[PDB]
Ligand binder design. Structure first.
Ligand code: HEM
Ligand code: HEM
Ligand SMILES: Cc1cc(N)nc(C[C@H]2CNC[C@H]2NCCNCc2ccc(Cl)cc2)c1
Ligand SMILES: Cc1cc(N)nc(C[C@H]2CNC[C@H]2NCCNCc2ccc(Cl)cc2)c1
Ligand SMILES: C[C@H](O)[C@H](O)[C@H]1CNc2nc(N)[nH]c(=O)c2N1
Ligand SMILES: C[C@H](O)[C@H](O)[C@H]1CNc2nc(N)[nH]c(=O)c2N1
Ligand SMILES: C[As](C)(=O)[O-]
Ligand SMILES: C[As](C)(=O)[O-]
Ligand SMILES: [Zn+2]
Lengths: 405, 402
């Protein structure tokens, strides 16, 4: 039949063909010889120009003026700017379109039904670490909006030839410190040990709790990073309690409201925005299953199972599964109680199936990473588990970048 | 060239060099990954045979010996004259074990070296196929102390139909289309249930009616055989603490025996070679009983648990699912029938990955299939990167014979 990937949904028995993959101009890690789909990790004016032209064509197609005078003029304008300077700059509306496309294009995001609704803060005039901090605080305030979260991204100046990058050292705007102990264990989040020590190496006076909010290490071009402490009033947190298990609250667990990724690179038409933090709202399993139950994270499964009085001596009691469910329920219940936006893994995957149907119609497909889209608990209980998916790289895109240190 | 493989829970890293031995292409390309898809969209025979024979002699540490060389001549002489060849029983046994070892979707591979191989290549009729199958079941079932086994029927031959078992598993429950478009029994087996009736089977009207086997000998219409009830071990499902669970009248058979896959060894193809092991509880508790397109009992169990099925945020689905999987383990354990839970199973697979890293420099594995359908990240395999590729001997899918 059609010479494109045939995609099947095994619950519904429905079929679609992905034609959008034909627009991919960047190769992933697989080959006919072996699939590396489960791996977490994957200028020449000549190449830049082709990427820039592709992006401008995308922009004009999106506003239905492809082939028009303005379209051709913009293309000539970009070529001229690159011709004389080596780079070029995006117009305001082009940046807005590009940022939304990058989210729309992210294969690992299950929240893409929301892609068209993104507040894009243009911070390309930012010229100091102190100002980066101002922009970040405004982002957090706007995005947090007292618990009624709003998706947002703040874009700082793009990488420039012969100049240092703007960089936020932290992986997220909000994260808990991880303190290496005497005995070799860790108090707080084990994932943040290195960033926590870098903050200390940089003058931060460390706390000693399990949930100490880390300061931000912000770096303006060609300068050492500066340290900034987030005012507590700005970081909304949710104390965790369980709807029926009264002792859960005594565990003293909590989590912050805003998931804000700050170390990814936003690439649009060949231009690279090394500092462009973006945020949305949590899907409950990110907190309840990964952050709280991963063995290499807070690892609280055994503690909660002991509290629930489960037989933690044998795997067949399914004590891990039982505790995980209650921990996830507590996260949902607590966020709901505190009126902070959150979406459970069932609702999220149901909305992602709608997004796939929308994109099939709008673009002929949707790049999706099955392993990342299917939730960490109750996998086959959600509709995405039964949906085959095609994964490929489209641009604009969010890409990982090496840590600045 | 060789992929770096990292385990994110432990921080350990390995390099897969075994993938360089793959000679068959998967579905992916540098442009797009199709790893989530369930199914794929004489000089050669001789090279595959040589490689296999090479594999065999290396396995018994007699590579290069006289026996190795003579065997290679034998194979070449037979292919040159007849266009095919035949395997010795010892080689067939080594071949079947390697095909299991190479199966990327199997989480139970730590057991790969323990497999009873039944040579059924001297089978000339559907009736004989049935006798072999019955003996396989009796042996594999062993009154509840399941033993892994495979029965190999005659290889495919040029200009001649295949020996085939039409059923996808030796034991399966009927799926009957009701007037109102619904289905009584297993919805996954509607088509096969209908073929059986069409081929003279007197259907039942229950929810767990064991289907009869449609066995096909070369170029003949398939024949119907009803398995003797006393041969099909089943486990009534009850819950350790919820008394009403047993009232649901749920049950499942003890023996998972795949019968529609093709076994390929040294270029030869065995279109009928049913194999069986023992269940991992989530196959029954999560997929068979809870899939929307299967028995779909989540809502019923949820209501019996008087859960709030009004909203997803109450996690009623997750809660019911866990109790159903608990009932399966409890029941099989009560009935003293072999079964392995998903935590124990994945822990053994991690050991297997380590054993194979030392033994062969890698292990082909399909992450999406190895990670259980519930509590994925609560198991060690979730945090383990895997490389997937096709090695031979191999088990592969083949067209339905109708
Ligand atoms: C509105 C709510 C949103 C929800 C519920 C959501 C949910 C998720 C989830 C569950 C993941 C996988 C995260 C992980 O396991 O580490 C993810 C990844 C991702 N999301 Fe979304 N997302 C949302 C908004 C956004 C926004 C506003 C952007 C960008 C404009 C975005 C960009 C991404 C990207 C690039 C990734 C992958 C990053 C990586 O590989 O680490 N998401 N999202
Ligand atoms: C002894 C205990 C065994 C257990 C616990 C086990 C477990 C599993 C599981 C959970 C799967 C994925 C099943 C699914 O979701 O459909 C699977 C697939 C598979 N297993 Fe094993 N296995 C065992 C024995 C065997 C044996 C004896 C063979 C062959 C000699 C075998 C060959 C395979 C193959 C080829 C697949 C993939 C089939 C497909 O893609 O449909 N297994 N096994
Ligand atoms: C806007 C938004 C909204 C929501 N709900 N969720 C996210 C995802 C974000 C919050 N939970 C996990 C974080 N992602 C980290 C993934 N690390 C991959 C990774 C990459 C590279 C390395 Cl070395 C390790 C790990 C972003
Ligand atoms: C020896 C053994 C031991 C255990 N424990 N489990 C198995 C697996 C077997 C029992 N439950 C699921 C069955 N697999 C069928 C896969 N269907 C995919 C599929 C392939 C092709 C189509 Cl058209 C649809 C679906 C085999
Ligand atoms: C090794 C494996 O790729 C890794 O653990 C992946 C699997 N799926 C995931 N899915 C999501 N959403 N987030 C993750 O961090 C991961 N980790
Ligand atoms: C579409 C998707 O590949 C499909 O639902 C897969 C996912 N993982 C699986 N894993 C196992 N063990 N068994 C299955 O049948 C599946 N189905
Ligand atoms: C229940 As708590 C210790
Ligand atoms: C069967 As009802 C509880
Ligand atoms: Zn792939």
């Amino acid at each position: 039949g059609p010479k494109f990937p045939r995609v099947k949904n095994w619950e519904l028995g429905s079929i679609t063909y992905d034609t959008l993959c034909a627009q991919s101009q960047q190769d992933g890690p697989c080959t006919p010889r072996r699939c590396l789909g489960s791996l977490v990790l994957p200028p020449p004016a000549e190449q830049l120009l082709s990427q820039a032209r592709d992006f401008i064509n995308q922009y004009y197609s999106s506003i239905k003026r492809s082939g028009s005078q303005a379209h051709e003029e913009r293309l000539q304008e970009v070529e001229a700017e690159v011709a004389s300077t080596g780079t070029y700059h995006l117009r305001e509306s082009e940046l807005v379109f590009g940022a939304k496309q990058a989210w729309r294009n992210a294969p690992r995001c299950v929240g893409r039904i929301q892609w068209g609704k993104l507040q894009v803060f243009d911070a390309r005039d930012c010229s100091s670490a102190q100002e980066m901090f101002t922009y970040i605080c405004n982002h957090i305030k706007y995005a947090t909006n007292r618990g009624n979260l709003r998706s947002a991204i703040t874009v700082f100046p793009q990488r420039a030839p012969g100049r240092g990058d703007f960089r936020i050292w932290n992986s997220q705007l909000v994260r808990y410190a991880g303190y290496r102990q005497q005995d070799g264990s860790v108090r707080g989040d084990p994932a943040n040990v290195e960033i926590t020590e870098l903050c200390i190496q940089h003058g931060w006076t460390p706390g000693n709790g399990r949930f100490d909010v880390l300061p931000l290490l912000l770096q303006a071009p060609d300068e050492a990073p500066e340290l900034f402490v987030l005012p507590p009033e700005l970081v909304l947190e949710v104390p965790l309690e369980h709807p029926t298990l009264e002792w859960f609250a005594a565990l003293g667990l909590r989590w912050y409201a805003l998931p804000a990724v700050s170390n990814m690179l936003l690439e649009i038409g060949g231009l690279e925005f090394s500092a462009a933090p973006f945020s949305g709202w949590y899907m409950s399993t990110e907190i309840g299953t990964r952050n709280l139950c991963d063995p290499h994270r807070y690892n609280i499964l055994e503690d909660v199972a002991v509290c629930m009085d489960l037989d933690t001596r044998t795997t067949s009691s399914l004590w891990k599964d039982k505790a995980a469910v209650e921990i996830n329920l507590a996260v949902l219940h607590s966020f709901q109680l505190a009126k902070v936006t959150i979406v459970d893994h069932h609702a999220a995957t149901v909305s992602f199936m709608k997004h796939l149907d929308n994109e099939q119609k709008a673009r002929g497909g949707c790049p999706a990473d099955w392993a990342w889209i299917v939730p960490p608990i109750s996998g086959s209980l959600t509709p995405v588990f039964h949906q085959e998916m095609v994964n490929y790289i489209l641009s604009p895109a969010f890409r990982y970048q090496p840590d600045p240190w």
